[PDB]
């Protein structure tokens, strides 16, 4: 049986669907992890490939390679779950209690051997996944860390953002690893991040007020911006196309899809609660899957 609040949806390269969800109300506050080789069968538990209960809720997750699942837990743990040989069990590889508060965000760095986590405890941590240890611990921020995002191609570079209003570009090769970046004037709080998968120099960020903006790291200047949403922007997900489209999800319960100049191509009101994640099919590049706290798994068709 599956808890109502769907937190995460990610396609594997082979087309199978990883699902994360928490119980955010009722007697038991926990979470679970699900694998759905039939993605159209989501989220019925009987018609799943694998599935397991976690100690506490899942605030975030990400695929590690092809069989690993890296989880941001309410408990302060970062955990790594391993997919079965058959891929019919999901087995705990490590549970490490290193954060002092809810771990809110997690991301795998380019070479698949390290990860960065972000916490309400205001810390950012760099993990050796093979070693199951915290390599580095950074208190750069002054309020809870909202999102960490690895660069596509460099193991020492990642974005982070906090309710302390700072967007930070990181580079563990420098003596002083973080460097504050963003728009001319300090605007609204940064709530979501995604690197451009082609131009490894550009990213987008979403704010608390529903604006999506495009940033050059080179210009240290905000290129374009658009008011996409009427509420906070919780996720930004680029399509796997040559010229990638950008999926935009929100607490206004809608999904939008925008082109590279950030114009609206599509919008979906299908959800009736917060939209928590988007994931593009590796197979059908026009098929896009969103999940939300309504416990709906919706497969969209994008022009």
């Amino acid at each position: 049986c599956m808890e109502r609040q769907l937190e995460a949806a990610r396609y594997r390269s082979d087309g199978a669907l990883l699902l994360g969800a928490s119980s955010l109300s009722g007697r038991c506050w926990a979470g679970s992890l699900w694998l759905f080789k039939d993605p159209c069968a989501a989220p019925n538990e009987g018609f799943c490939s694998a599935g397991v209960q976690t100690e506490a809720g899942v605030a975030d997750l990400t695929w590690v390679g092809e069989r690993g699942i890296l989880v941001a837990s309410d408990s302060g743990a970062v955990e790594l779950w391993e997919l079965d040989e058959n891929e019919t069990l999901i087995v705990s590889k490590f549970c490490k209690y290193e954060h002092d508060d809810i771990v809110s965000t997690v991301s795998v760095l380019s070479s698949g051997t390290q990860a960065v986590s972000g916490s309400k405890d205001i810390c950012i941590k760099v993990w050796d996944l093979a070693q199951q240890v915290v390599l580095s611990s950074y208190r750069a921020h002054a309020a809870q860390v909202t999102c960490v995002a690895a660069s596509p191609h460099k193991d020492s570079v990642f974005l982070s953002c906090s309710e302390d209003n700072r967007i930070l570009l990181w580079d563990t090769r420098c003596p002083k690893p973080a460097s504050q970046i963003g728009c001319s004037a300090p605007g609204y709080l940064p709530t979501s991040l995604a690197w451009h998968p082609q131009q490894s120099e550009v990213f987008v960020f979403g704010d608390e007020n529903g604006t999506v903006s495009l940033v050059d790291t080179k210009s240290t200047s905000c290129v374009l911006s658009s008011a996409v949403h009427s509420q906070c922007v919780t996720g930004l997900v680029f399509s796997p196309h040559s010229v990638p489209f950008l999926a935009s999800l929100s607490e206004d319960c809608s999904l939008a899809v925008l082109d590279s100049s950030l114009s609206e191509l599509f919008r979906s009101q299908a959800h009736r609660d917060f939209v928590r994640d988007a994931t593009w099919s590796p197979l059908n590049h026009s098929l896009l899957t969103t999940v939300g706290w309504d416990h709906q798994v919706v497969h969209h068709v994008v022009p």
Binding site: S22, L24, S25, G26, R27, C28, W29, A30, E55, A56, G57, A59, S73, D74, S75, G76, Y97, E98, H99, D100, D101, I102, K120, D121, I122, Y138, R139, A140, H141, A142, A143, Q144, D164, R166, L168, C174, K176, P177, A178, S179, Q180, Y188, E208, N209, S230, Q231, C232, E251, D252, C253, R272, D273, F274, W293
Partner: protein
């Protein structure tokens, strides 16, 4: 033993978690009452219509467990002071919702953070909650010694942490608490959960919190060090603060995960227990005072009222006051009658205000210690104690002691005294009219006669203390001036307070007083150099007295008579708190005033700003002649 809770921000199952932490040793648990990640919408559809339940059920704990074991926590996404209107309105409504739920549940406390400068709207919402109905939870505001922004790693290349020290800046969080608490008009329901950091800030930043209503101190696991054998312990400097916090008596709260994997959570706890086991034991004074900290008493009306038998009982047990008197009487006897006169010379000794007789006995012990001879009068105005006295001189003293039932200002003495002995002293020395009483008695002391005490002096010190300011404010009564509480002094065992400058002498009286024209009125100006930032709430008074020569009594802290519990300090409030800054001078003015019927004090602060003149005319407070 310490009282301590566990702070958690993750609770999968309530029954399990409560058990686990109770096993570990904790007295209570701080947890979310809604899931910390469960952002609710109150206005926009469809999110607003989210099917319930909105949280987990009250049935999961007994009514008693809720009332004694659980401290609520505001959900961390609730931001009433956000610059985004919609977030401001969901937060306003969600804060109400969570606060109403804690009240429904009967929770004894509830935590809310001050984690930024502007908390106006949080303050307004909470004030509004406080003034809605009849619920009982304390509110603990989670404030750090050091702001998060001033605590960060210096690891941002283009945003360095500012190196040059700012005396003010490092007190920024006291001002967070101060403004918040002012906004909410000093509600007795709002207290401090002070969060202690790995790096302590400077003394001065920490002292700042002296006299604030600290109900709990939050210790992250991360601030603990590791000893030889792997156990958690604290730095020397952290220990000093633990001791000050134990002395104050607060509840400790452990927060964060186990950073000593070798042992369980009870290890942190056992260190705190170790610390309190290891502090000094209560001295004799501290044991007497134990129940009385910041408890406010109306001072005795010494003349218009008669003390109760049990009041004489409690103070007769003073292990220092009477043996000090004996020693004064002893030294005086020798000085007045030479060895050759010893069996020829009989000293007339009068005890003025003899109570149940201890100073009469002390006199008697002084005579067969000096080996000299004395005739005793025991004068007492309280006819009820006169019963104890007259039963003493029949069964014991014999005709050596002449018991006299009357006022010393009234008595027609058969002969003159060599020595008058009295203890007519209150905590501000002369606040029981010892001057007026001994003045009207002195006509029967021989021209070369000694008074014991020979003199006394009162002292004043400015103080900070929100707690006491609030205890006074709460003393408002029906059918009198709504501000009278502030225009009278209180005998109080000052405990949760900060003394802002060293005590300075105020009024002085000498006995006998053969001033051609006797005047007991006084006017005095005091200038108190202050070297911290703070808020002034009143003046602690104390006193010193010269019994005889070098034999003294004192409640001035610097020269306090050890073991002597007979007097607590006195507190003289002011109607309105006054902000004082580093390096400023507090100027205060006291008058002693009288007419034929009564005596009173009037006071006013004149710098760094003026207060109203307090108690003009004895309008709120007089001492009856």
């Amino acid at each position: 033993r310490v009282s301590s809770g566990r702070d958690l921000n993750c609770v999968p199952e309530i029954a399990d978690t409560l058990g686990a932490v109770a096993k570990q040793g904790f007295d209570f648990l701080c947890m979310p009452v809604f899931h910390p990640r469960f952002k609710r919408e109150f206005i926009q559809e469809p999110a607003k219509n989210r099917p319930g339940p909105q949280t987990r059920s009250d049935l999961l704990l007994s009514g008693r467990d809720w009332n004694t074991l659980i401290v609520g926590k505001l959900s961390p996404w609730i931001r009433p002071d956000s610059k985004v209107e919609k977030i401001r309105r969901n937060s306003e409504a969600a804060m109400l919702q969570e606060l109403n739920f804690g009240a429904y549940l009967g929770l004894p406390a509830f935590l809310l953070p001050l984690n930024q400068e502007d908390n106006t709207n949080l303050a307004r919402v909470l004030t509004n909650h406080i003034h809605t109905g009849h619920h009982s939870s304390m509110f603990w505001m989670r404030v750090p010694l050091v702001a998060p922004e001033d605590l960060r790693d210096d690891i941002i290349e283009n945003a360095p942490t500012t190196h040059t020290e700012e005396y003010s800046g490092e007190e920024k969080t006291w001002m967070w608490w101060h403004n918040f608490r002012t906004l909410c008009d000093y509600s007795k329901r709002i207290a401090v959960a002070l969060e202690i950091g790995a790096d302590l800030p400077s003394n001065h930043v920490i002292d700042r919190w002296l006299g604030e209503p600290i109900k709990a101190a939050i210790l992250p696991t991360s601030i603990f060090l590791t000893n030889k054998k792997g156990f958690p312990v604290l730095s020397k400097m952290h220990q000093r603060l633990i001791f000050r916090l134990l002395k104050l008596e607060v509840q400790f709260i452990i927060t964060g995960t186990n950073h000593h994997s070798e042992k369980e959570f009870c290890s942190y706890l056992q260190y705190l227990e170790y610390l309190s086991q290891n502090r000094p034991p209560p001295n004799a004074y501290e044991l007497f005072a134990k129940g009385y900290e910041d408890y406010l008493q109306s001072p005795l009306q010494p003349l218009m009222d008669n003390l109760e038998s049990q009041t004489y009982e409690v103070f007769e047990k003073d292990p220092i006051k009477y043996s000090q008197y004996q020693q004064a009487i002893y030294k005086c006897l020798l000085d007045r009658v030479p060895e050759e006169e010893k069996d020829t010379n009989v000293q007339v000794l009068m005890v003025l205000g003899a109570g149940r007789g201890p100073l009469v006995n002390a006199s008697l012990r002084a005579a067969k210690q000096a080996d000299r001879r004395i005739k005793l009068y025991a004068v007492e105005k309280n006819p009820n104690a006169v019963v104890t006295l007259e039963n003493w001189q029949f069964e014991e003293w014999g005709s050596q002691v002449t018991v006299v039932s009357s006022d010393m200002r009234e008595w027609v003495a058969p002969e003159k005294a060599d020595i008058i002995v009295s203890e007519l002293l209150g905590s501000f020395a002369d606040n029981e009219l010892s001057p007026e009483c001994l003045d009207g008695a002195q006509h029967f002391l021989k021209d070369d006669g000694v008074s014991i005490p020979g003199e006394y002096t009162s002292f004043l010190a400015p103080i900070s203390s929100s707690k006491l300011y609030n205890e006074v404010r709460a003393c408002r009564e029906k059918d009198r001036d709504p501000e009278a509480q502030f225009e009278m002094p209180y005998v109080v065992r000052l405990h949760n307070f900060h003394q802002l400058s060293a005590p300075q002498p105020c009024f002085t009286f000498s006995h006998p007083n053969r001033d051609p024209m006797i005047d007991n009125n006084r006017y005095c100006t005091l200038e108190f150099p202050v070297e911290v930032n703070t808020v002034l709430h009143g003046f602690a008074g104390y006193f010193e007295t010269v019994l005889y020569q070098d034999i003294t009594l004192s409640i001035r802290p610097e020269t306090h008579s050890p073991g002597m519990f007979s007097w607590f300090p006195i507190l003289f409030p002011i109607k309105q708190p006054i902000t004082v800054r580093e390096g400023q001078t507090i100027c205060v003015r006291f008058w002693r005033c009288s007419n034929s019927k009564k005596v009173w004090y009037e006071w006013a602060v004149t710098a760094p700003v003026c207060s109203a003149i307090h108690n003009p005319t004895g309008r709120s407070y007089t001492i009856g002649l």
